[PDB]
Amino acid sequence: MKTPLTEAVSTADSQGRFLSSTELQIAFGRLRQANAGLQAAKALTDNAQSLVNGAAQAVYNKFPYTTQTQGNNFAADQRGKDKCARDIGYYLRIVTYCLVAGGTGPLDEYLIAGIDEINRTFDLSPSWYVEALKYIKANHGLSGDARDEANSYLDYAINALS
Amino acid sequence: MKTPLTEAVSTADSQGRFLSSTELQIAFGRLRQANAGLQAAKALTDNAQSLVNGAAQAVYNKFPYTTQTQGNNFAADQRGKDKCARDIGYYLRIVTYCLVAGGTGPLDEYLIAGIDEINRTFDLSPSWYVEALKYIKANHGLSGDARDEANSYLDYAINALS
Amino acid sequence: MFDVFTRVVSQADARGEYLSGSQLDALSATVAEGNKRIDSVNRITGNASAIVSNAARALFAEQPQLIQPGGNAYTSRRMAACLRDMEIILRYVTYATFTGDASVLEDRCLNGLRETYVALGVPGASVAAGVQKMKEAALDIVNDPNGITRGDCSAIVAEIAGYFDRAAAAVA
Amino acid sequence: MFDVFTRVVSQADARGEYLSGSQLDALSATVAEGNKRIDSVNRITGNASAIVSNAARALFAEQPQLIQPGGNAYTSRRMAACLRDMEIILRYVTYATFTGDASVLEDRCLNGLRETYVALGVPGASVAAGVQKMKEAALDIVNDPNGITRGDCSAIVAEIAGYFDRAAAAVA
Amino acid sequence: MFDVFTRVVSQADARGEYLSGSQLDALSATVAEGNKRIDSVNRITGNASAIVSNAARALFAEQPQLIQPGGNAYTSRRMAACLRDMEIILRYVTYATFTGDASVLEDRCLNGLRETYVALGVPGASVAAGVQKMKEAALDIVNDPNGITRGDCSAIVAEIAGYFDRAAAAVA
Amino acid sequence: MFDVFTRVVSQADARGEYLSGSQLDALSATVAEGNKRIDSVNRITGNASAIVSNAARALFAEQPQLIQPGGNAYTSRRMAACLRDMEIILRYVTYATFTGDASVLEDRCLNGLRETYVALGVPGASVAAGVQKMKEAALDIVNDPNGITRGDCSAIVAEIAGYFDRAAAAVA
Amino acid sequence: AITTAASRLGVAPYNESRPVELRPDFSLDDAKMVIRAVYRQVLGNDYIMDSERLKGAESLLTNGSISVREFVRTVAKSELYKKKFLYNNFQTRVIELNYKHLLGRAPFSEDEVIFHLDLYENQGFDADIDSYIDSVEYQENFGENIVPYYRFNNQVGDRTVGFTRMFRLYRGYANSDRSQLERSSSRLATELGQNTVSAIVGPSGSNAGWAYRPSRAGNTPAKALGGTVPFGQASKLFRVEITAISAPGYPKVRRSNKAVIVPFEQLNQTLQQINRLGGKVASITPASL
Amino acid sequence: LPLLNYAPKSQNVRVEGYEIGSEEKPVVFTTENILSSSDMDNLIEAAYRQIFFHAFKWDREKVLESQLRNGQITVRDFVRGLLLSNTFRNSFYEKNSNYRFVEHCVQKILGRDVYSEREKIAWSIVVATKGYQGLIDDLLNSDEYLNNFGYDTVPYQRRRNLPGREAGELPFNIKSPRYDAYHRRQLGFPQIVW
Ligand SMILES: *[C@@H](C)[C@H]1/C(=C/c2[nH]c(/C=C3N=C(/C=C4\NC(=O)C(CC)=C4C)C(C)=C\3CCC(=O)O)c(CCC(=O)O)c2C)NC(=O)[C@@H]1C
Ligand SMILES: *[C@@H](C)[C@H]1/C(=C/c2[nH]c(/C=C3N=C(/C=C4\NC(=O)C(CC)=C4C)C(C)=C\3CCC(=O)O)c(CCC(=O)O)c2C)NC(=O)[C@@H]1C
Ligand SMILES: *[C@H](C)[C@H]1/C(=C/c2[nH]c(/C=C3N=C(/C=C4\NC(=O)C(CC)=C4C)C(C)=C\3CCC(=O)O)c(CCC(=O)O)c2C)NC(=O)[C@@H]1C
Ligand SMILES: *[C@H](C)[C@H]1/C(=C/c2[nH]c(/C=C3N=C(/C=C4\NC(=O)C(CC)=C4C)C(C)=C\3CCC(=O)O)c(CCC(=O)O)c2C)NC(=O)[C@@H]1C
Ligand SMILES: *[C@H](C)[C@H]1/C(=C/c2[nH]c(/C=C3N=C(/C=C4\NC(=O)C(CC)=C4C)C(C)=C\3CCC(=O)O)c(CCC(=O)O)c2C)NC(=O)[C@@H]1C
Ligand SMILES: *[C@H](C)[C@H]1/C(=C/c2[nH]c(/C=C3N=C(/C=C4\NC(=O)C(CC)=C4C)C(C)=C\3CCC(=O)O)c(CCC(=O)O)c2C)NC(=O)[C@@H]1C
Ligand SMILES: *[C@H](C)[C@H]1/C(=C/c2[nH]c(/C=C3N=C(/C=C4\NC(=O)C(CC)=C4C)C(C)=C\3CCC(=O)O)c(CCC(=O)O)c2C)NC(=O)[C@@H]1C
Ligand SMILES: *[C@H](C)[C@H]1/C(=C/c2[nH]c(/C=C3N=C(/C=C4\NC(=O)C(CC)=C4C)C(C)=C\3CCC(=O)O)c(CCC(=O)O)c2C)NC(=O)[C@@H]1C
Ligand SMILES: *[C@H](C)[C@H]1/C(=C/c2[nH]c(/C=C3N=C(/C=C4\NC(=O)C(CC)=C4C)C(C)=C\3CCC(=O)O)c(CCC(=O)O)c2C)NC(=O)[C@@H]1C
Ligand SMILES: *[C@H](C)[C@H]1/C(=C/c2[nH]c(/C=C3N=C(/C=C4\NC(=O)C(CC)=C4C)C(C)=C\3CCC(=O)O)c(CCC(=O)O)c2C)NC(=O)[C@@H]1C
Ligand SMILES: *[C@H](C)[C@H]1/C(=C/c2[nH]c(/C=C3N=C(/C=C4\NC(=O)C(CC)=C4C)C(C)=C\3CCC(=O)O)c(CCC(=O)O)c2C)NC(=O)[C@@H]1C
Ligand SMILES: *[C@H](C)[C@H]1/C(=C/c2[nH]c(/C=C3N=C(/C=C4\NC(=O)C(CC)=C4C)C(C)=C\3CCC(=O)O)c(CCC(=O)O)c2C)NC(=O)[C@@H]1C
């Protein structure tokens, strides 16, 4: 669970020392990024359903075979589409968690760790989720620091998948 | 390298022991399997080009998008088709190596180790190679212990991929 | 471990829901309190040696039997172990103040500490008394109005006091 | 390792003198150019996998004997090792860009890297070519004017180019 | 470590080619020789203790300067090291005979042995003479005709002789 | 250096007694094998340029990374140094065949060659591959039954193969 | 030749340095160049103060009264040379220095040490210097009119052991042969006695692990006797020389230089561990297979 | 898969002890001291006691001992070879559950007791996923091992005895014999007497 405050305390405790001005500057950077991150999390939360549906539709457009090929790993039926929308919602919600926490820790703990075994086992191609994340990047309509931090989390997820 | 003779000697050496009756039985089992394995390797080698071309075509039939979707990771152009045929040839040739050596050691050292990082990095789906291996299973025309050993290697690759 | 943000994040993920508007506003209010939190951490850190030494001196003045021969704090090694324990408890209290969550204090300092003291015969009640003396000295240092931008630091003082009480109760 | 501030600190300490006004305002310029450095690090990091994969594809296209059987990048394990190496070089270049000093790159990445490539039979010239391809892609991504507050990033781009050049000279 | 099969497999993989008919038939010829290979390994193993002890006794009889006070085989630890070195060489010869390849004997027994002997002052020529004694004893045991299915074992005997000569050449 | 006679002479002098009847008989056997030793030396020497050129061609065909621009056999100076190295290895192998002892090959050519190749960045595994190619060519040249008084030369061929193996192992 | 690794070693400045030959009917710059080259090479790049310069030998060489070979002989027999290289050195170190200065190469075997030590002890230093200079090797390489130079490149009667030992004797261009880490100790006594080689470690500014030197005892051997067995399953083994280990501090760190034989699979971990311990990798050499 | 996060517990090894060398300070058996053959025998026996408690000559690894004597391998490599040896697999891995194999690995490699049952649980999956040698190398390459024993020092039970106290914590060879009640009842013991 990687966030600036927890990482600062982990570094100080590993060396067995009190929090010096280095950790205070870390906290200052966390405070500087925090409000932007929280409004971005709120903006993503309010526009979550449309973003998830559009990302799922974009994946279906980029990979049409997922919509008519039979099999458990495809979205040919309604169950597969529900699984796809649920996964994209998981991605978006954990990204908002990362924005709230100020680090990739929620993605690392909830989604990134073990996702390779998931996709290999259930024959889900990571390129689908990469397309969903790219749609989210292009369409969240954020700006400035909020956009930069949210895009950092989405690119972190993309890099993990690719 | 996981082959009966090398593994028997490595286990004996790690124990610092002379080769006892257990290692002799390992050699006897290897001798029982070796002629069938060598004949399977010969049959696969003699039918290598046809098996590889048919496997590539079966992959293209089951996953048609790989033949008309533009991108480096697909076989839309001749370059991707050559890469695909070369990959399937790698699979078949290393399977013959396994048949010669009497174990999955060639697959492990040459193909299995690090294949998931390759597939993720170059956005190649393991399901394509799984279909190619299933074609090789269904059309190698082997019987008896040759078929069982060759199918064991092909299933090893399939399980490593899926 | 957890900080203020990560605790709410973990709870929301267990619920499988987005952080609500109320939780986001509460976290923003915590962020607005962040400068005072950093000042509190800095002030306790800058006087940590004084806090530990003065609290130890007061503890051994009101409990002379600790430093009498045969007492638990008697001999240099034990006495130094006691000072070091007090410093460690204060350091993890500062960690908890910095992160705003008690997870670091519970997981890395107080986990099994009572059992350690029971096994060694260290009087846990006297450790709690030393922790309380650290608490009072630390809170006075955090609330000192001289040379700082005036404002209401009551919430951070209460949170630090809660961490100190938690450390004292883990050993008492 | 050293950062940009710690490097001049170490030089001044070896000379045993306070940082002069020229050094102080050179550091103030460094701080003033801090946002662009952070942007460059973030842009290279966000496209790291694409940089590594595209550079690997270009390198193996220009040098097909690397990936043909008997070639050093043949077999899955050696291919994965090559990819990982590319990612490691990119990661340490980003580290050096973040710090403003190439000490992390020398001490933690290129320390023993030539020797290791020689001992293993890794062609140093080819990995240097891969590092050059990553250099062109990374500098292209850093200098991308879309979606960012316009400004002159020539100095930070030149610094990143120097880090990549030093890595390429270290491996060949 | 290479056995007889994996050596040709690795050469083929490096060349990127399937094994030709001649290589497959040579491996089949090796397979037809496997029972005799297992008998030779079993017979040397069954008399390993006698081979090592008798060879050492004969070597010390014809070279009394090894076991003289102050000689290299004097003191119990050095004598035990000598007996151990003999047993290790014999064991690795059996390993090479079993696998049909000298890679195990080369890599794990002979690589660096000459340097170790020169550095310590162990006479490599005397070690080679002891190895020759184990050679002759072992080959007489493998070639013993009673209690075994009669057959031509000249090829296997020549291969074991080659391993023994290789060990003797390495230690001197 | 040592030849086949001086080797047993040195061992006997270290032991301080006369060569035994068996040693003299073994030396007489080696003398009886002298014509075939001279024939093998003459045949490799007469075909030395063909052996070196053909094996270099085969090596650069199977390892094109050696001769790509940036490879260690690229540029005239390097190509010529590589060809000269292979001829040097062949020449010292022939010397070892002539003397009946590997000391000239080990002491003058092979000792320190691995460290040299590591320092220069010469890939030792490829050198070993070229040496193995010279081995196969030279062995087929020695065994050619055309234009020579027929006889069994398997022992001499095995000795030459052993010298080539020592050369190939010393560089990797 | 040495092309890719020339700059890393100290060979690059000698690659474009042609031998200094005194032609018949030479000019005064030719004479001064010969004097400068002889001082630099015979005295091993030591700074030569004006008061220590052999004025008479220089005059005689300038005049043509002596040849380049004779001038080299006069410099090598001078009290300046004996003060710099003879009087404070073990005679094996003297032999190493003689081979490096007068022949431009390292000693090949213990036989040269035997010959030169016997000759020094039986006939003196001057006769030993004469044997270096009247040798067939000197005549074929330098002759009468060429200043001796470092023979880095492969030649007709070479042994590769000499190529490895050259970098034990030569430590870079801005180095002076009396300003090397090993100082007055013989660099090749163990190597010549045991007929062994050391992994080549390049000069300071081009090689971070330049300062690595093995200790008197407790050194990891060159080859991995035993193979991969002590390391469980492993593919290949490598000897890694590490210098400047300091971070943990004493007593955790006893010797700042350490050689370790490690498997291929632990090479990544070995490198990270080296970075943590603050060390510099001097060399990595295959130890198995 | 990343290791489970488990909280540490208050331990003597986690805290500064201000230790002065005494009879209770474990003997530092290190090859950095250029040990004679008899001192190497003592070091080797210390490694055998740390890893196998006691080593019968059937349990000895004479090839590993020769390699350690020659400098082929470090002390840590010899410890790894002991852990990868047949004796250790048969006595400590085979006869125990995975959880009670992590204990007997934390205790004798890191020289400290396990933090909790959760630590045992977290490290027990490593054998079945990364392999047996995967677990051995993870423990040997850990920061705890390298910071305490490095490459050249035989591991030992750390900070067992506090100064002035008559008795410290139980020695791990007493606290944790090779097997426990599971293999005990598989064998059929305890046996009734008379
Ligand atoms: C030269 C080495 C000597 C020799 C060997 C020889 N053996 C066989 C045949 C067999 N030997 C065995 C061996 C074993 N059976 C076991 O169960 C064990 C213990 C595990 C051993 C070692 C076997 C299975 C056979 C086949 C059946 C049989 O009993 O004959 C042969 C015959 C040819 C063949 O390859 O099978 C030969 C030649 N014979 C000599 O005269 C040499 C002194
Ligand atoms: C394996 C090496 C091949 C082989 C050799 C072989 N040669 C001979 C006999 C002789 N070879 C020579 C050679 C030369 N005479 C010269 O004047 C020169 C030039 C300087 C040479 C090299 C000689 C003198 C003899 C003896 C007379 C003769 O011509 O026969 C033999 C016969 C046995 C012997 O030791 O004399 C053999 C076996 N034979 C093969 O089949 C291999 C391909
Ligand atoms: C959508 C982009 C594509 C798609 C989706 C799809 N996914 C599954 C199954 C699973 N998805 C996950 C992923 C997660 N679970 C989590 O808890 C999290 C972290 C918070 C993630 C990212 C998992 C674990 C599964 C398998 C178990 C499950 O059923 O939930 C399926 C079904 C696969 C099957 O075999 O039933 C599908 C269809 N399908 C498409 O075609 C889209 C392109
Ligand atoms: C065919 C089933 C489908 C397909 C293939 C395809 N593969 C690649 C590229 C690579 N394939 C490999 C595989 C191996 N190389 C090895 O060394 C081994 C072990 C013997 C294996 C299995 C690798 C490493 C690559 C990447 C680098 C390379 O060039 O070799 C491509 C090219 C992708 C790219 O970006 O260049 C393609 C197209 N694609 C399809 O659509 C087929 C259905
Ligand atoms: C890819 C562009 C080129 C290439 C690469 C290649 N590298 C290796 C092996 C190793 N690379 C390293 C380097 C590092 N390890 C680290 O942890 C770090 C940070 C300090 C670095 C820089 C190491 C130590 C190894 C060996 C250990 C390991 O686990 O790989 C290989 C494999 C070689 C082999 O398997 O024999 C390869 C293939 N190869 C090319 O052809 C490209 C030019
Ligand atoms: C240089 C290569 C390119 C470039 C950069 C540039 N950036 C800024 C200013 C800012 N960039 C940031 C960055 C972030 N905010 C976040 O929240 C995150 C994630 C944590 C990041 C990476 C910030 C905070 C600023 C300052 C405020 C602002 O938005 O402007 C500038 C402006 C000057 C400055 O140094 O601040 C510039 C020039 N612009 C280019 O055209 C180059 C391609
Ligand atoms: C006996 C025939 C002769 C002899 C032997 C002798 N050897 C040593 C010491 C060592 N021998 C080895 C060899 C090996 N150990 C390995 O791990 C391997 C690979 C599996 C081999 C072959 C080693 C490494 C040593 C050094 C360390 C050790 O003590 O074992 C000695 C002891 C020398 C000493 O104690 O100083 C002796 C006596 N000596 C004779 O006189 C015989 C001719
Ligand atoms: C002066 C600022 C500091 C200082 C210097 C000092 N240096 C030496 C000795 C040598 N300096 C060199 C350097 C070079 N020689 C070259 O040829 C080149 C270019 C290729 C360089 C850079 C060498 C090799 C030596 C040794 C040769 C010699 O004759 O000494 C000394 C002399 C040391 C001594 O005499 O013991 C000194 C004093 N000393 C200071 O205190 C200044 C900080
Ligand atoms: C005689 C009492 C003992 C003895 C002697 C012995 N020594 C050697 C060999 C060498 N001795 C030296 C010594 C020196 N080099 C110097 O520079 C100085 C003077 C400044 C000294 C004293 C050297 C360098 C050698 C090597 C060269 C040579 O061999 O002459 C040997 C020969 C060793 C061999 O195997 O060749 C011997 C015999 N040996 C004993 O047994 C006596 C106890
Ligand atoms: C060719 C198969 C491979 C190859 C070779 C290569 N070698 C060098 C350079 C040298 N080779 C030697 C070797 C020796 N010197 C000796 O005296 C002896 C015999 C006693 C040997 C075997 C040495 C010392 C050098 C350097 C000095 C010199 O060359 O004169 C090079 C040149 C490297 C460079 O230019 O830096 C090369 C290319 N290279 C390959 O790629 C082939 C696999
Ligand atoms: C003091 C008179 C001089 C001085 C000393 C100095 N030493 C170090 C660092 C180390 N010293 C050691 C010591 C030893 N290793 C051993 O095994 C032994 C015998 C048991 C000894 C004496 C070691 C290992 C180190 C490195 C690790 C450590 O620092 O503990 C330093 C620090 C060097 C640095 O910059 O890291 C210093 C300063 N320096 C002087 O100027 C005096 C002349
Ligand atoms: C001081 C206020 C009181 C006191 C203290 C005392 N404590 C000890 C001994 C130890 N304390 C610890 C504690 C911790 N270990 C952990 O992991 C954590 C979190 C990081 C803590 C706080 C432990 C493990 C010990 C034993 C190890 C050691 O002492 O080095 C002592 C010493 C007891 C002894 O017998 O030596 C003492 C005296 N004693 C008082 O009287 C005060 C009330």
Q: Which of E104, E108, E112 sits opposite G221 (nearest CB)?
A: E112
Residue in chain H nearest E83 by alpha carbon: H62
* Distant-in-sequence contacts of C5-9, Cβ < 8 A, 24+ apart: C5/A3, C5/A5, C5/A34, C5/A100, C5/A101, C5/A102, C6/A1, C6/A3, C6/A6, C6/A101, C6/A105, C6/A106, C6/C101, C7/C101, C7/C103, C8/A100, C9/A97, C9/A100, C9/A101, C9/A106
Cα three-residue angle G47-G49-G55, rounded to 5 degrees: 120
Contacts of B114 in chain G (CB under 8 A): none
Question: Which superfamily does CATH assign the domain made up of F1-172 to?
Answer: Phycocyanins (1.10.490.20)
Distance of CA H176 to the CA centre of its chain: 11
Is the CB of A66 within 6 Å of ligand 3? Answer: yes
Technique used to solve these coordinates: cryo-EM
Contacts of G240 in chain D (CB under 8 A): 112
How many whole angstroms separate alpha carbon D22 and alpha carbon D6? Answer: 16
Contacts of E10 in chain D (CB under 8 A): none
> Within 10 A of B83 (CB to CB), how many other CB atoms are there?
16
**How many residues make up chain B in this entry?**
162
Contacts of E14 in chain D (CB under 8 A): 69-70
How many whole angstroms separate alpha carbon E51 and alpha carbon E44? Answer: 8
Closest by CA position to G211, among listed G175, G180, G247, G179: G180
Residue in chain B nearest A64 by alpha carbon: B65
- Whether the CB-CB separation of B120 and A116 falls below 8 Å is answered with yes
Atom of ligand 2 nearest to the CA of F39: 22
How many whole angstroms separate alpha carbon E163 and alpha carbon F96? Answer: 20
Instruction: Give B52-71 as a DSSP string.
Output: HHHHHHHHHHHSGGGGTS-S
How many whole angstroms separate alpha carbon C67 and alpha carbon B152? Answer: 75
Ligand 3, atom 4, lies closest to the CA of A84
How many whole angstroms separate alpha carbon G83 and alpha carbon C51? Answer: 67
Tally the C-alpha atoms within 13 A of residue H125's C-alpha that lie toward its C-beta: 8
> Which two tokens mark C127?
């450790």
Give alpha helix (H) positions in chain D. Answer: 4-15, 21-32, 34-46, 48-62, 76-99, 103-108, 113-120, 124-142, 154-171
Chain E: closest CA distance from residue F54 (Å): 17
G253 alpha carbon – ligand 11 mean position (Å): 10
> Which residues form the pocket of ligand 8, taking CB atoms under 6 Å from any ligand atom?
G 45-47, 173-176, 179
Which of D91, D103, D111, D118 should one mutate to test binding to chain G, selecting the residue with the greatest count of G CBs within 10 A?
D111
H184 alpha carbon – ligand 4 mean position (Å): 54
The whole domain housing B35 covers: 1-162
Q: What total number of domains does chain A contain?
A: 1
Residue C32, CA distances (Å) to A32, A34, A148, G85 in order: 10, 10, 22, 75
Contacts of E13 in chain D (CB under 8 A): 69, 75
Is the CB of E48 within 6 Å of ligand 7? Answer: no
Residue A48: which CATH number?
1.10.490.20
> Which residues form the pocket of ligand 6, taking CB atoms under 6 Å from any ligand atom?
A 33, 144-145, 148-149, 152; D 35-36, 38-40, 42, 142-145, 148-151, 153, 156
Chains E and D touch (3+ CB pairs under 8 A): yes
Contacts of D70 in chain F (CB under 8 A): 62-63
Closest by CA position to A81, among listed A59, A50, A110: A59
Decide: helix, strand or coil at residue G231: helix
Tally the C-alpha atoms within 13 A of residue B74's C-alpha that lie toward its C-beta: 14
How many residue contacts between B and H have a Cβ separation below 8 Å?
9
> Which two tokens mark E95?
């390993």
B60: left (phi over 0), alpha (psi -120 to 50) or beta: alpha
How many whole angstroms separate alpha carbon E168 and alpha carbon F103? Answer: 14
Is the CB of F63 within 6 Å of ligand 2? Answer: no
> Which two tokens mark F79?
């190509």
Is the CB of F38 within 6 Å of ligand 2? Answer: yes
How many whole angstroms separate alpha carbon G3 and alpha carbon G153? Answer: 11
Instruction: For F58, list phi and psi in degrees, rounded to 5.
Output: -65, -40
**E165-E166-E169-F3 Cα dihedral, nearest 10 degrees:** 80
Pairing of strands G258-263, G237-243: antiparallel
Q: What is the side-by-side strand order in the sheet with G237-243?
A: G258-263, G237-243, G280-286
Beta-carbon contacts of G86 under 8 Å, excluding residues fewer than 6 positions away, are: G94, G125
G85 alpha carbon – ligand 8 mean position (Å): 18
Tally the C-alpha atoms within 13 A of residue G229's C-alpha that lie toward its C-beta: 32
Decide: helix, strand or coil at residue A72: coil
D24 alpha carbon – ligand 3 mean position (Å): 55
How many whole angstroms separate alpha carbon E21 and alpha carbon G197? Answer: 45
Residue in chain A nearest H1 by alpha carbon: A114
Stated resolution in angstroms: 2.1
Decide: helix, strand or coil at residue G262: strand
How many whole angstroms separate alpha carbon F168 and alpha carbon G61? Answer: 50
- Whether the CB-CB separation of A106 and A98 falls below 8 Å is answered with yes
Give alpha helix (H) positions in chain G. Answer: 12-15, 28-42, 55-63, 68-77, 79-81, 91-98, 110-123, 125-133, 136-141, 160-169, 189-194, 267-276
Chains C and B touch (3+ CB pairs under 8 A): no
B83 alpha carbon – ligand 4 mean position (Å): 5
Which bound ligand lies closest to the C-alpha atom of H30? Answer: 11
How many whole angstroms separate alpha carbon G66 and alpha carbon G73? Answer: 10
How many whole angstroms separate alpha carbon G258 and alpha carbon G266? Answer: 16
G260 alpha carbon – ligand 11 mean position (Å): 22
> Which two tokens mark G252?
């955790």
Is the CB of G27 within 6 Å of ligand 10? Answer: no
- Whether the CB-CB separation of A133 and A158 falls below 8 Å is answered with yes
Give alpha helix (H) positions in E16-153. Answer: 21-32, 34-46, 48-62, 76-99, 103-105, 113-120, 124-142
How many whole angstroms separate alpha carbon E170 and alpha carbon G225? Answer: 12
Q: Do D71 and F65 touch (CB under 8 A)?
A: yes
Pairing of strands G258-263, G280-286: unpaired
